[PDB]
Amino acid sequence: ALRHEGERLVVPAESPLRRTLAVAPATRETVAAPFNLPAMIEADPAKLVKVLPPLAGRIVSLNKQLGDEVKAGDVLFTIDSADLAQANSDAAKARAAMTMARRNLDRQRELDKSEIAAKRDFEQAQSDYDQAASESQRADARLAQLGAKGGGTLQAGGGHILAVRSPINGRVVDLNAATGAYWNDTTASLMTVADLSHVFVTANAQEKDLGHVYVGQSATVKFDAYDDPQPGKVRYVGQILDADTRTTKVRMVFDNPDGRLRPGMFAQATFLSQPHEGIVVPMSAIVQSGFYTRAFVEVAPWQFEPRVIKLGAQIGDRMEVKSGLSAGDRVVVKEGVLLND
Ligand SMILES: [Zn+2]
């Protein structure tokens, strides 16, 4: 009665599970798991651009339209920033005032001096100037900031109207802007240009099936709502998990000549791992407590040690233990030498 503890678990020599416990060495065998991954269609990250405006302002026009063809670099929309209007003139004011305010000062130094001095008014002269200068210096920077943002899309004259161009060839794939509407946000994004002649079919894999993927495979992709499955080859790859989901991206590029392949659609895939010599236990041997997962190994007769393992592929009741658990260990089957009940 019935499990004593060191950390490692000793069974008397007395106890009932002395009948019901069972063990076998851990056998290395060949594995060639077929495995299956959820996937989604994805535009080629660019290849696709959500075009944003460089500055806010009234939309003057929408050349190009949902479905319309585009070439790099057509004009897609035009913005009347104002905004940039103000700031251009304000800084015209700002400077005028200064320059004038200045030479009003300069003509008050020369009459203190030369001949005979007049009145304190020099005092206003200076305060007035110092101020107009600071304010101009202010306007100067507002223009500076703004023009740096919308300088590359300006035309000569106009109203200070920006013309945003498309940087790549494709079709207008999303719209969501109105002529006359003011656009305040950014990104925001007035439209979306894209060339989906080819798409990514991006499947996502788990640590379970991560040693089982390789650039080079060898995939069968079955969408919905398309009955007829379709072949692919993975181009990428791995190689870091996603923290939230703990999956990694495994993507294959598809031709989309029709293109019944639409970014967003769902699919599955459908792979075969290279044969490799792997170690495998029955389900009866694995136990989970949290985010783990471990088997029990006999030491020492009737003395067991926990062992943190991971894990998969499985199917059916056989389970690939990818570490470990190494060849020969007397693993239990099993079972609840982890509760005392
Ligand atoms: Zn494996």
Coordinates of C-alpha atoms and ligand atoms in Angstrom, one line a residue:
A1 CA 0.0 0.0 0.0
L2 CA 0.9 1.2 -2.5
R3 CA 3.3 3.8 -3.9
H4 CA 6.0 5.2 -1.8
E5 CA 7.9 8.3 -2.9
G6 CA 11.5 9.4 -3.3
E7 CA 10.4 11.5 -6.2
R8 CA 10.9 8.3 -8.1
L9 CA 8.1 5.8 -7.4
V10 CA 8.7 2.6 -5.5
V11 CA 6.0 -0.2 -5.3
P12 CA 6.1 -2.7 -2.4
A13 CA 6.6 -5.7 -2.0
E14 CA 3.1 -5.7 -0.7
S15 CA 0.9 -3.5 -3.0
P16 CA -2.0 -4.4 -5.3
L17 CA -0.8 -2.7 -8.6
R18 CA 2.0 -5.3 -8.1
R19 CA -0.4 -7.4 -10.1
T20 CA -1.8 -4.9 -12.6
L21 CA 1.4 -3.0 -13.6
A22 CA 2.9 -4.2 -16.9
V23 CA 6.1 -3.3 -18.9
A24 CA 7.9 -3.7 -22.2
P25 CA 11.2 -2.4 -23.6
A26 CA 10.9 0.6 -25.9
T27 CA 11.2 -0.6 -29.5
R28 CA 12.7 1.4 -32.4
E29 CA 10.7 1.0 -35.7
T30 CA 10.3 2.6 -39.0
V31 CA 7.7 5.5 -39.3
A32 CA 6.2 7.1 -42.4
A33 CA 3.3 9.0 -41.0
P34 CA 0.7 10.4 -43.3
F35 CA -0.3 13.7 -41.8
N36 CA -2.8 16.4 -42.3
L37 CA -2.6 20.2 -42.0
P38 CA -5.3 22.9 -42.1
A39 CA -4.5 25.6 -44.6
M40 CA -5.8 28.8 -46.0
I41 CA -5.1 30.7 -49.3
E42 CA -2.9 33.8 -49.0
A43 CA -1.9 36.4 -51.5
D44 CA 1.8 36.6 -52.2
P45 CA 2.6 39.3 -49.5
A46 CA 3.6 41.6 -52.3
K47 CA 2.5 41.0 -55.2
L48 CA -0.2 42.7 -52.9
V49 CA -0.4 46.3 -51.6
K50 CA -3.1 48.0 -49.6
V51 CA -2.4 51.5 -51.0
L52 CA -2.5 54.3 -48.4
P53 CA -2.5 58.0 -48.9
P54 CA 0.6 60.0 -47.8
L55 CA -1.6 62.8 -46.3
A56 CA -5.3 63.2 -45.4
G57 CA -7.6 65.3 -47.4
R58 CA -10.6 65.3 -49.8
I59 CA -10.5 62.5 -52.4
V60 CA -10.7 64.4 -55.8
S61 CA -10.9 61.3 -58.0
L62 CA -10.9 57.5 -58.3
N63 CA -9.2 56.4 -61.5
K64 CA -9.1 52.6 -61.5
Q65 CA -12.0 50.6 -60.1
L66 CA -13.0 47.3 -58.5
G67 CA -11.9 44.8 -61.1
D68 CA -10.0 47.3 -63.3
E69 CA -6.6 46.3 -64.6
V70 CA -3.6 48.2 -63.4
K71 CA 0.1 48.6 -64.4
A72 CA 3.0 50.1 -62.4
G73 CA 2.6 52.8 -62.1
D74 CA -0.8 54.0 -63.0
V75 CA -2.4 56.7 -60.8
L76 CA -5.1 55.2 -58.6
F77 CA -6.4 58.1 -56.6
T78 CA -5.8 61.8 -56.0
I79 CA -6.0 63.7 -52.8
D80 CA -6.7 67.4 -52.1
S81 CA -4.9 68.0 -48.8
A82 CA -5.7 71.2 -47.1
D83 CA -4.0 70.9 -44.7
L84 CA -1.0 71.3 -47.0
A85 CA -2.9 74.2 -48.4
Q86 CA -3.0 76.3 -45.1
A87 CA 0.6 75.4 -44.1
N88 CA 1.9 76.6 -47.5
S89 CA 0.3 80.0 -47.1
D90 CA 0.6 80.3 -43.4
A91 CA 4.3 80.0 -43.9
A92 CA 4.0 82.7 -46.5
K93 CA 2.3 85.0 -43.9
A94 CA 4.7 83.9 -41.1
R95 CA 7.7 85.1 -43.2
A96 CA 6.2 88.3 -44.5
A97 CA 5.4 89.5 -41.0
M98 CA 8.9 88.6 -39.9
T99 CA 10.8 90.3 -42.7
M100 CA 8.7 93.4 -42.4
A101 CA 8.7 93.4 -38.5
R102 CA 12.5 93.1 -38.9
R103 CA 13.1 96.2 -41.0
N104 CA 10.9 98.0 -38.7
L105 CA 13.3 97.1 -36.0
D106 CA 16.3 98.0 -38.1
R107 CA 14.7 101.4 -38.6
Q108 CA 14.8 102.1 -34.8
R109 CA 18.4 101.2 -34.1
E110 CA 19.5 103.9 -36.6
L111 CA 17.6 106.7 -34.9
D112 CA 18.7 105.8 -31.4
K113 CA 22.1 106.3 -33.0
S114 CA 22.7 108.7 -36.0
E115 CA 21.9 112.3 -35.0
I116 CA 19.4 112.0 -32.1
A117 CA 17.5 109.2 -30.3
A118 CA 13.7 109.1 -30.2
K119 CA 11.5 106.8 -28.2
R120 CA 11.4 103.4 -26.3
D121 CA 9.3 102.0 -29.2
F122 CA 12.4 99.9 -29.9
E123 CA 10.9 97.8 -27.2
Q124 CA 7.8 96.8 -29.2
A125 CA 10.0 96.6 -32.3
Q126 CA 12.0 93.8 -30.6
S127 CA 9.3 91.9 -28.9
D128 CA 7.3 92.1 -32.1
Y129 CA 10.1 90.8 -34.2
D130 CA 11.3 88.0 -31.9
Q131 CA 7.6 86.8 -31.9
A132 CA 7.0 86.9 -35.7
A133 CA 10.3 85.0 -36.1
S134 CA 9.3 82.3 -33.7
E135 CA 5.9 81.9 -35.3
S136 CA 7.4 81.7 -38.8
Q137 CA 9.9 79.3 -37.5
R138 CA 6.8 77.4 -36.4
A139 CA 5.0 77.5 -39.7
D140 CA 8.3 76.5 -41.3
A141 CA 8.3 73.2 -39.6
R142 CA 4.6 72.3 -40.1
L143 CA 5.3 72.7 -43.9
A144 CA 8.6 70.8 -43.5
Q145 CA 6.8 67.9 -41.8
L146 CA 3.9 67.8 -44.2
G147 CA 5.8 68.1 -47.5
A148 CA 8.2 65.3 -46.4
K149 CA 5.2 63.0 -46.2
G150 CA 3.5 64.0 -49.5
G151 CA 6.4 65.3 -51.5
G152 CA 6.9 62.2 -53.8
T153 CA 3.3 62.3 -55.0
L154 CA 2.8 66.0 -55.7
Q155 CA 2.1 67.7 -59.1
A156 CA 3.1 71.2 -60.3
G157 CA 0.2 73.5 -59.5
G158 CA -3.2 72.0 -59.0
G159 CA -4.4 73.0 -55.5
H160 CA -1.6 71.1 -53.8
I161 CA -3.2 67.8 -54.9
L162 CA -1.4 64.5 -54.4
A163 CA -1.5 61.6 -57.0
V164 CA -0.8 58.2 -55.5
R165 CA 0.4 55.6 -58.0
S166 CA 0.4 51.8 -58.0
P167 CA 3.9 50.3 -57.6
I168 CA 3.0 46.9 -59.1
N169 CA 0.9 45.2 -61.8
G170 CA -2.4 43.6 -61.0
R171 CA -6.1 44.2 -60.6
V172 CA -8.0 46.4 -58.1
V173 CA -9.0 43.7 -55.6
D174 CA -10.7 45.8 -52.8
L175 CA -12.3 49.3 -52.9
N176 CA -13.9 51.0 -49.9
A177 CA -13.4 54.7 -50.7
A178 CA -15.8 57.4 -52.0
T179 CA -15.1 60.4 -54.2
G180 CA -15.6 63.5 -52.2
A181 CA -15.2 61.7 -49.0
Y182 CA -12.5 63.0 -46.6
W183 CA -9.9 60.4 -45.7
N184 CA -8.4 60.8 -42.2
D185 CA -6.8 57.5 -41.2
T186 CA -3.6 55.7 -42.0
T187 CA -2.9 53.0 -42.9
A188 CA -6.6 53.3 -43.6
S189 CA -5.9 52.3 -47.3
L190 CA -8.1 53.5 -50.1
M191 CA -7.9 50.4 -52.3
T192 CA -6.0 47.1 -52.7
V193 CA -4.0 46.2 -55.7
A194 CA -3.0 42.5 -56.2
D195 CA -1.7 40.0 -58.8
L196 CA -3.1 36.6 -57.8
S197 CA -2.0 34.7 -61.0
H198 CA -0.4 32.6 -58.3
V199 CA -1.3 32.2 -54.6
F200 CA 0.2 30.8 -51.4
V201 CA -1.6 27.8 -50.0
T202 CA -0.3 28.2 -46.4
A203 CA -0.7 25.3 -44.0
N204 CA 0.2 25.6 -40.4
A205 CA 1.9 22.8 -38.5
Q206 CA 2.4 21.8 -34.9
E207 CA 5.5 20.6 -32.9
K208 CA 3.9 17.2 -33.3
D209 CA 4.5 17.3 -37.1
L210 CA 7.4 19.6 -37.5
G211 CA 10.2 17.1 -38.0
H212 CA 8.0 15.6 -40.6
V213 CA 8.0 18.6 -43.0
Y214 CA 10.7 19.4 -45.6
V215 CA 11.2 21.8 -48.5
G216 CA 10.7 19.5 -51.4
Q217 CA 7.4 17.6 -50.5
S218 CA 5.0 16.5 -52.0
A219 CA 1.5 17.6 -51.0
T220 CA -2.1 16.9 -51.8
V221 CA -4.4 19.9 -51.3
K222 CA -8.1 19.5 -51.1
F223 CA -10.0 22.7 -50.9
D224 CA -13.8 23.3 -50.6
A225 CA -15.8 24.0 -52.4
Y226 CA -13.8 22.2 -55.0
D227 CA -14.3 18.4 -55.2
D228 CA -11.2 17.6 -57.1
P229 CA -8.1 17.5 -55.0
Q230 CA -4.8 19.0 -56.3
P231 CA -1.0 18.5 -56.0
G232 CA 1.5 20.9 -54.6
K233 CA 5.1 21.2 -53.5
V234 CA 6.3 23.1 -50.3
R235 CA 8.7 26.0 -50.9
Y236 CA 8.8 27.2 -47.3
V237 CA 9.9 25.9 -44.8
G238 CA 9.8 26.5 -41.1
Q239 CA 11.0 28.1 -38.8
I240 CA 9.7 29.9 -35.8
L241 CA 6.5 29.3 -33.8
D242 CA 3.7 31.9 -33.3
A243 CA 3.6 32.2 -29.5
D244 CA -0.2 32.5 -29.4
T245 CA -1.0 29.5 -31.6
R246 CA 2.3 27.6 -31.3
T247 CA 2.2 26.6 -35.0
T248 CA 4.7 27.4 -37.8
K249 CA 3.9 28.4 -41.4
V250 CA 4.3 25.7 -44.1
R251 CA 3.6 27.1 -47.5
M252 CA 3.4 26.0 -51.1
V253 CA 2.9 28.2 -54.1
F254 CA 0.0 27.4 -56.5
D255 CA -0.8 28.4 -60.0
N256 CA -4.1 30.2 -60.2
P257 CA -4.9 30.5 -63.8
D258 CA -8.6 30.6 -63.4
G259 CA -8.5 31.7 -60.6
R260 CA -10.8 29.6 -58.5
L261 CA -8.1 30.0 -55.9
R262 CA -9.1 33.0 -53.6
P263 CA -7.0 34.3 -50.8
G264 CA -8.9 33.3 -47.7
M265 CA -10.4 30.1 -48.8
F266 CA -9.8 26.9 -46.8
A267 CA -8.0 23.7 -47.7
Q268 CA -6.3 20.7 -46.2
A269 CA -3.0 18.9 -46.8
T270 CA -1.9 15.8 -46.8
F271 CA 1.8 14.8 -46.7
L272 CA 4.1 11.8 -46.2
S273 CA 7.2 12.0 -43.9
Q274 CA 10.4 10.4 -45.1
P275 CA 10.9 7.0 -43.6
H276 CA 13.1 7.3 -40.5
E277 CA 13.8 5.0 -37.6
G278 CA 11.6 6.3 -34.7
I279 CA 10.6 5.1 -31.2
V280 CA 7.0 4.2 -30.5
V281 CA 4.9 3.3 -27.5
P282 CA 1.2 2.5 -27.1
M283 CA -1.2 5.1 -25.9
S284 CA -1.6 3.3 -22.6
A285 CA 1.9 4.5 -21.8
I286 CA 1.6 8.3 -22.2
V287 CA 0.1 10.6 -19.6
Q288 CA -0.7 14.3 -19.6
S289 CA -0.9 16.6 -16.5
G290 CA -0.6 20.0 -18.0
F291 CA 1.4 21.2 -21.0
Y292 CA 3.0 17.8 -20.6
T293 CA 3.0 14.6 -21.1
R294 CA 5.4 11.9 -19.9
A295 CA 5.9 8.1 -19.6
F296 CA 7.2 6.1 -16.7
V297 CA 10.4 4.1 -16.8
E298 CA 11.4 1.2 -14.5
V299 CA 14.9 1.6 -13.0
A300 CA 15.4 -0.9 -11.0
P301 CA 12.6 -3.5 -10.4
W302 CA 9.4 -1.9 -9.2
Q303 CA 11.1 1.5 -9.0
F304 CA 9.9 4.0 -11.6
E305 CA 11.1 7.5 -12.7
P306 CA 8.9 10.0 -14.5
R307 CA 10.0 11.0 -18.0
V308 CA 9.2 14.2 -19.8
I309 CA 8.5 13.2 -23.4
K310 CA 7.2 14.7 -26.6
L311 CA 5.5 13.3 -28.9
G312 CA 3.6 12.4 -32.1
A313 CA 2.9 11.4 -34.8
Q314 CA 0.3 8.9 -33.6
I315 CA -2.3 6.6 -35.2
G316 CA -3.6 4.4 -34.4
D317 CA -2.9 3.4 -30.8
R318 CA 0.8 3.7 -31.6
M319 CA 2.6 6.9 -30.6
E320 CA 5.9 8.2 -31.8
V321 CA 7.9 9.5 -28.9
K322 CA 10.4 11.9 -30.5
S323 CA 12.4 12.3 -27.1
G324 CA 12.9 10.6 -24.9
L325 CA 12.8 7.8 -23.8
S326 CA 15.5 6.0 -25.7
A327 CA 16.0 2.4 -26.9
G328 CA 15.5 -0.3 -24.3
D329 CA 13.9 1.6 -21.4
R330 CA 11.4 -0.4 -19.6
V331 CA 8.3 1.8 -20.1
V332 CA 5.1 1.2 -18.2
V333 CA 1.6 0.3 -19.7
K334 CA 0.9 2.0 -17.6
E335 CA -0.9 3.6 -16.0
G336 CA -2.0 5.7 -13.0
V337 CA 1.2 5.6 -11.0
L338 CA 0.6 9.4 -11.0
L339 CA -2.3 9.9 -8.6
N340 CA -2.8 7.2 -5.8
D341 CA -6.5 6.3 -6.0
Ligands
ZN1 ZN 9.2 11.4 -36.8

